[PDB]
Design a protein around this ligand. Structure first.
Ligand SMILES: NC(=O)CC[C@H](N)C(=O)O
Ligand SMILES: NC(=O)CC[C@H](N)C(=O)O
Ligand SMILES: NC(=O)CC[C@H](N)C(=O)O
Ligand SMILES: [Mg+2]
Ligand SMILES: [Mg+2]
Ligand SMILES: [Mg+2]
Ligand SMILES: [Mg+2]
Ligand SMILES: [Mg+2]
Ligand SMILES: [Mg+2]
Lengths: 443, 443, 443
């Protein structure tokens, strides 16, 4: 209980807040919001503020259904950049049905349902250390984004010299005021690409920070005449952006993934986790990579996962176990990207792992080998399966997997598939310029 | 034996030919060619003219391999538009190995191998009446094609008024001089789209005319400041172009598809044919629709096949049996498109039909029903299977089918798949503008 | 020492530092870093902050590997230009392996190693007084560099008036606030060319500054709407840039090069040092001139070394010995340029010098006449050899030398050659406009 009803009231008044954003997340991971004037804070904290809950299912809405917003006193934050008379504050809310019961369609609640499922197995915490990457493009005369990158930096270079303005820098500074515990940032492989790494955090909190992060990144970027984008693969030929997820299970307050005695200092629970992730990897990809373009990133040669396998040191594995041990022992999943709905993404990732731990699934053999060279022949000769090549392919796999499906719930699942199937269909019937440049005159 | 060595020599001289085009077709259906000066006609008719035969496998060439061109005295034609001193004549050739044996890689020969397979069953002829459709676009200042259509006509309208120049009209006139037996032409559904229907003709000859047709259509069109294209789906939202194939089997010189006594006046042989086509339809689609874009046409709502079924009157069936009976009784296959390699396309279509006749496969029930409305539920409840949605999907189906695979031969098959797999892969890793307009700012 | 963890602690607290850059250097001499918030300072000073150490190898990276950063409390500096609200501080860190051992691939480490061999042979310090040269170009509308120079000044001219804006002055001023001790600065031979000479300092201090200098320069240059470049030869026909290195060996705190009563006042050790550099010059040229463009600077007629010879007065000696003596007695290597990686260039130059000292090599006769006039044949009659003409030549030469290869270490060496070999290969296969301007019509 970070803040209390009174701690919140004292703050809004002393900090002269005049605008409160009650934010939430829909089925597509998009950051939704219902804003009210400070004069309504009371009604907000009372959980009486209603809104059309059908907005949580995204562009698949069919009917208007009244619902409540239950603000989380802990998510209370104030936006520094907004200043003077008009100071804005936010509240990440939870959606409840008119009767008082939590809305199944809400993805944030889904993560809670699965976390509860975690505690029923004996685990206390499930931390997540995200590695969100993004691209910054220049803005044209008007205000529309162009294909020009904000810089020409490389992997870990000293991008935009401190003098003047430096987006990445200025973003981190804003995130600190709000209360972010950023680990560190750097310039990414491709020119104009940036990365801000978060610190360890509980599932829900960590996921809430991912949503806010994008908001702070997009806003500040626009304030510097730039355009921030978390699109997996904005440009063909250059590196794509991913959102590595460093997962870690705890029991009684201790890292349940550490074992200073077993190989790689990993415990039986850790390896079972690895197994669960490997068994469902190709099945939950539709969730960790929800967009069509998400699969243009999952192409070999750009340090992005393409096959289900884990290692401690490799070109670009699906699962990677960082050097750090002890309380830092963690399982990194590199397939996840920034376009993924954090709440849903973690739910499915938690369900996969827990499935292996609960059923004591056997973890495959590490592979410090090279998947890049060996053709599919060896990949077949070995337990190396490829990840779905298209959104369509991933959606067919997701449906078959029963634990993954039940990981999202009846309501969430139903709509997720409906939204994506339409999304895909829209893309498959589209005629791209590339098609004409290849056929228009050749045929 | 339309022409003879002497009939050819007398013609070239009297018509003052100064340039001979020895043409052939590669694996991708592209019209290849090796041109020689009239002074070499003798060496040509002697079958001594060599060329790099690796050019028949297309962009998958790996080594240079000398081969011979064996001109077909029957395919001898003279291009009317080419005039004066420089009159051009052509010769569709056959490829032979240095030793004197026919090249397996040659698609035109493949059709001959399968036609021979037809005669071994008791059939004399296998006629084909093609319905090639195309689009005409305007040319910009320079000479590059634009997205502007040559007109705004509709289905069977009186497009471009006779006065001045009218491509479609002027094309037909050129085709007649050369000796084409055109049935009739009209304006197609979509604006700027045209169709010239051929008359009944033997497989090989009919296929040879399809190749020449495209050549005459592309050339004359350019001569009118226009750009002709046989690309399946040039524009999203407008009708696509297909190449309906009206097939018909003969025995002893009579239409083996007619039976003035059985239902629909169709014979047992005709229905067996229907069965063969239905059993392999989804398997040979990769051949009758070889390009990626070929599947943007196979989308509902544009009068293009989307499900395996046959009828005599329906929205847009895969197999259609024209009204005409007697010697005109024929089985129309509407899935085939202009981008298809005629020689390969027919081979696979002949093999499918013959498979049903040889094994007396049972033909499904006609369907004057509506596939467009009934969801996949009924399509499942019925023997209604969908055609492959992507080139990839069609290529996976083609490989599994054994009769279809053996319908192309070891050498042809091997390369066809290699070329398409690469083609597809090129397309799947591409980042289309559509992707950014949908994600660039949404994420 | 210079700073204590407490000194830094107080400074960052009093100077209101908010951003901390932990910088280092990759194999290509490129300035890199990992940025962390001031709240992570403790973890930084605790040597716990990690990063992907593969970033050290540059574009030749293969697999991501965790590593630690050890901040050098003495390299702590505070960038003045950074706004009060967001003060930025830096720390040139050292790269270590997960097990607490110095990473062999770290360039700054290698220099430290070579310096140990210097201490073993009985030497106290090894000073370096670099003469960085650089050009300044104008920025177009999109902040893009142009071939337009910043002034039409000459050698030592009073380039750019004391107008409101004057990059060179403003650079030296900013460096003064950063604790940089600059000897003097002037305007170079070519228009828009500038030079800033630092006071001599230790091998590491000097290198670390060469890095910081490049950063400050480029930074302040961008603030003035200009673009700073250390590219050895930006424009054809104009002078190139070279970072002359004034080397000075110390023994027991005194100048081991000076000799009161000795020919030319150069001690024995001094002479051997000269010899050490002459036999290894052609070999270590690939390190002190790491780019393809570097060799375009190494051409006669522009005050750039083209032959291996030393002298006190000459047109363009590879090794020049300035006037001043005593503790100012030094050896200047003029072949080195600003694109070279300071740490690697100093390691190869120190190695060559120590080779000549430990093996008592005899120094050749100093060339005091014009070497430009002596034909290729003449230079052969005397001890006169040409430096590598192209990067490729320099590379093969470098591998042929053992003491030089050991100067970089197997790990550093393997990657250097890898990067440069693929680098040259790109250049070699490139087709330049020049080639087309010279063969397009002539052929
Ligand atoms: N070094 C890296 O972590 C690169 C990650 C890369 N941007 C990706 O697509 O995952
Ligand atoms: N009426 C028609 O035959 C239309 C055919 C349509 N152009 C197709 O794609 O097949
Ligand atoms: N010191 C100078 O005169 C500079 C000479 C020239 N810039 C070089 O290449 O070294
Ligand atoms: Mg990364
Ligand atoms: Mg990572
Ligand atoms: Mg038609
Ligand atoms: Mg038709
Ligand atoms: Mg100088
Ligand atoms: Mg000098």
């Amino acid at each position: 209980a970070k803040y209390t009803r009174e701690d919140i009231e004292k703050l809004v008044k002393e900090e002269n807040v005049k605008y409160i954003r009650l934010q939430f997340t829909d089925i597509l991971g998009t950051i939704k919001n219902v804003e009210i004037p400070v004069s309504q804070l009371g009604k907000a904290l009372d959980n009486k503020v209603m809104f059309d809950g059908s907005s949580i299912e995204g562009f698949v809405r069919i009917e208007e259904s009244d619902m409540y917003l239950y603000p989380d006193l802990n998510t209370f934050v104030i936006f520094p950049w907004t200043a003077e008379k008009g100071k804005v504050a936010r509240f990440i809310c939870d959606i409840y049905n008119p009767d008082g019961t939590p809305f199944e369609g809400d993805p944030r609640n889904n993560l809670k349902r699965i976390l509860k499922e975690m505690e029923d197995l004996g685990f206390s915490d499930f931390n997540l250390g995200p590695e969100p990457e993004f691209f910054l493009f220049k803005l044209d005369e008007k205000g529309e984004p162009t294909l020009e990158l904000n810089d020409k930096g490389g992997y870990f270079d000293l991008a935009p010299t401190d003098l003047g303005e430096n987006c990445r820098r200025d973003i981190v500074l804003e995130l600190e005021e709000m209360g972010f515990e950023i680990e560190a940032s750097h310039h990414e492989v491709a020119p104009g690409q940036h990365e801000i790494d978060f610190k360890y955090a509980g599932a829900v909190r960590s996921c809430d920070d991912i949503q806010t992060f994008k908001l702070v990144v997009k806003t500040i970027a626009r304030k510097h005449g730039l355009h921030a984008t978390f699109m997996p693969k904005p440009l063909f030929g250059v590196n794509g952006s991913g959102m590595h997820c460093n997962l870690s299970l705890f029991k009684n307050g201790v890292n349940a993934f550490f074992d200073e005695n077993a190989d790689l200092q990993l415990s039986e629970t850790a390896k079972h986790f690895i197994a669960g992730i490997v068994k469902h990897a190709t099945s939950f990809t539709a969730v960790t990579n929800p967009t069509v373009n998400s699969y243009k990133r999952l192409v070999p040669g750009y340090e992005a996962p393409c096959y289900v396998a884990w290692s401690a040191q490799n070109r670009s594995p699906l699962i990677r176990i960082p050097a750090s041990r002890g309380i830092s022992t963690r399982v990194e999943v590199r397939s996840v990207d920034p376009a993924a709905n954090p709440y849903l993404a973690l739910s499915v990732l938690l369900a996969a792992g827990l499935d292996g731990i609960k059923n004591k699934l056997e973890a495959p053999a590490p592979i410090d080998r090279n998947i890049y060279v060996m053709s599919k022949e060896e990949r077949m000769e070995n337990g190396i399966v490829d990840l779905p090549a298209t959104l369509a392919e991933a959606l067919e796999e997701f449906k078959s997997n029963e634990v993954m499906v039940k990981a999202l719930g009846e309501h969430l699942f139903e709509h997720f598939i409906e939204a994506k199937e339409i999304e895909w269909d829209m893309f498959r019937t589209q005629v791209h310029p590339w098609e004409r440049e290849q056929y228009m005159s050749q045929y």
